[PDB]
Design a protein around this ligand. Structure first.
Ligand code: BR
Ligand code: BR
Ligand code: BR
Length: 253
C-alpha cells in the first residue's frame, strides 16, 4: 500500500534485495540494479533533484541517499507529508551495513536486513586486504570537464585501500586536475576508471593521452581496470565482488 521512490543506486538495490520491489514506483538515474529498476520512471539525477519530479509519482515514502542534492528538495518533500528516510552515504565498507539497516528499518524488514548484513559481512571479510605494493590512480572525468585525479576522502581511495592497494595520489583530499608532472610523480601501476569516465573521454585509448599518463608504469603497459560507476563507487551490496576483482587485478601484476 506504500509507494516508494528510491534515490541512489545503492539504496534502490538494497530495497529490492529486501523484497520491496512491488512497492517501488520510481528511482533516480544512478539506479540501474537490479534490471527491474531500469523499467521504472526516472525522477532525475541524484545530485540534481527537483521536487516536482518526485512528487509527480505520488510517493508515500522517499528512501534517499545522504548524497542526494540539493538538500532543499528533501525538505520540500518532507513538508508535503512524504516520509523521507535518509540512508547513510559514507563511502566505507562499514557503511554498507548501516545502509542496509536504514532501509530494513524503514521497510519493517529488520530480520531480513540482519541476514543481508551477516552475508555482506562474511563476503567482505573473505577479500584479502593485506597490503600489496601496487599504486592505483583513479581518474574521474566528464563530457568535457577537465579530467581529475582522486585523492583521499573519496570513494575511490576507500576502495583502493580496502583491496590492499595504495592510492598513487597522496596528500590532498577530493579531486584535482591532472597535471603531467603530478601524474608522472604519482607513478601508478594501474589506472582505474569508470564506464562513464571512459564515455566522457570518448574511448579507452584517450586515457593514454591524458597528462603524463603515457610516462607511468600503467601507461607503459596500458594497464587498466574499467568498472561500472555505481558498482565501483556506490558502496552497495556488490562492494565485496568489486574489491575482490580489484585485488585480483593488483595481484596478477
Ligand atoms: Br548524480
Ligand atoms: Br570517487
Ligand atoms: Br590490462
Amino acid at each position: 500500500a506504500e509507494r516508494i521512490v528510491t534515490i541512489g543506486g545503492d539504496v534502490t538495490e538494497i530495497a529490492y534485495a529486501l523484497g520491496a520491489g512491488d512497492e517501488i514506483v520510481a528511482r533516480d538515474s544512478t539506479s540501474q540494479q537490479p534490471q527491474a529498476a531500469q523499467k521504472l520512471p526516472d525522477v532525475g539525477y541524484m545530485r540534481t533533484l527537483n521536487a516536482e519530479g518526485i512528487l509527480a509519482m505520488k510517493p508515500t515514502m522517499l528512501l534517499v541517499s545522504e548524497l542526494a542534492q540539493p538538500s532543499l528538495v528533501l525538505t520540500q518533500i518532507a513538508s508535503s507529508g512524504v516520509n523521507v528516510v535518509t540512508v547513510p552515504g559514507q563511502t566505507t565498507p562499514e557503511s554498507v551495513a548501516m545502509k542496509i539497516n536504514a532501509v530494513a528499518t524503514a521497510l519493517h524488514q529488520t530480520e531480513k536486513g540482519q541476514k543481508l548484513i551477516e552475508d555482506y559481512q562474511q563476503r567482505l571479510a573473505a577479500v584479502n586486504k593485506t597490503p600489496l605494493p601496487v599504486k592505483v590512480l583513479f581518474v574521474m572525468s566528464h563530457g568535457g570537464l577537465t579530467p581529475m585525479a582522486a585523492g583521499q576522502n573519496t570513494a575511490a581511495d576507500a576502495m583502493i585501500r580496502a583491496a590492499g592497494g595504495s592510492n598513487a595520489m597522496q596528500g590532498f583530499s577530493r579531486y584535482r586536475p591532472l597535471s603531467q608532472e603530478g601524474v608522472i610523480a604519482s607513478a601508478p601501476d594501474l589506472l582505474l576508471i569508470t564506464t562513464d569516465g571512459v564515455k566522457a573521454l570518448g574511448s579507452s585509448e584517450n586515457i593514454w593521452k591524458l597528462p603524463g599518463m603515457a610516462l607511468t608504469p600503467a601507461g607503459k603497459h596500458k594497464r587498466l581496470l574499467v568498472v561500472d560507476d555505481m558498482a565501483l563507487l556506490g558502496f552497495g551490496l556488490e562492494t565485496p565482488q568489486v574489491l575482490a576483482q580489484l585485488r585480483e587485478k593488483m595481484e596478477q601484476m
